[PDB]
Amino acid sequence: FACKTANGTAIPIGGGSANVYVNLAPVVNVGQNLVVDLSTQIFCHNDYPETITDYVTLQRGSAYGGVLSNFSGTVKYSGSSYPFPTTSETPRVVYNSRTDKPWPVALYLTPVSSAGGVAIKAGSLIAVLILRQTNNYNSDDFQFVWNIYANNDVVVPTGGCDVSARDVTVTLPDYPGSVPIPLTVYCAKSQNLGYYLSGTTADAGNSIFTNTASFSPAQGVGVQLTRNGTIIPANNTVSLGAVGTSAVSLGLTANYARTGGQVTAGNVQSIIGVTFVYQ
């Protein structure tokens, strides 16, 4: 039994725990969200397949690590799905070839939020996997740990729906111009979806966001969002009706709005949060 990652780096087998760096592409699916498919990341082979046949299972106590430590889910192992954290040992994968075959493992997450996400940074631990290696010819039976680290910055979707972007940046035309905000949303299966805006408001009506621009900033103006010509105030539920696998625009448009007093020349900036809810 010998393994290597996608980039050809060898995984030392046995000894202490191994730090295995892998790529993530988290997506929502029906009834579960994918954190990582290791079958494209880890590949393994047998050097004496004619005489020796290697067996490898996933031992119980394999669980998420780091920011994901908190979550539960499943692990699809060799076509079958099992709860994750693993409560019992999985069935074995056979390694009877000198040709590198992938390690058929995919880590899933049970949806808990509407459209939430967890930031996962490059270099951070995401799972702690305990493996048990045996063979068909002698009594060698050994366990070792594979700490799975992320090789790229991603955001694991913790809900039934996924946003087109976690950080949107729009540029307003010069005052008093407006511009649409590019942002859509979709769900694994149909969800009666809505959302509301949050952030620091300038007015009592909670419909204008404060200008937090630092350098040569404008006075007397803030940012205000509209949808179909209708002003959207903060902490106000916007219904999107039924949202399915097809992306549905939020319909949001950015605008300027006077906050009161003389309007003076300068930069304008406003950070506005969007939070999704079920209905």
Add this chain to the structure above:
Amino acid sequence: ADVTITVNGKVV
């Protein structure tokens, strides 16, 4: 929040 919209603008 789920998404963060940073609006940039100018008053000339």
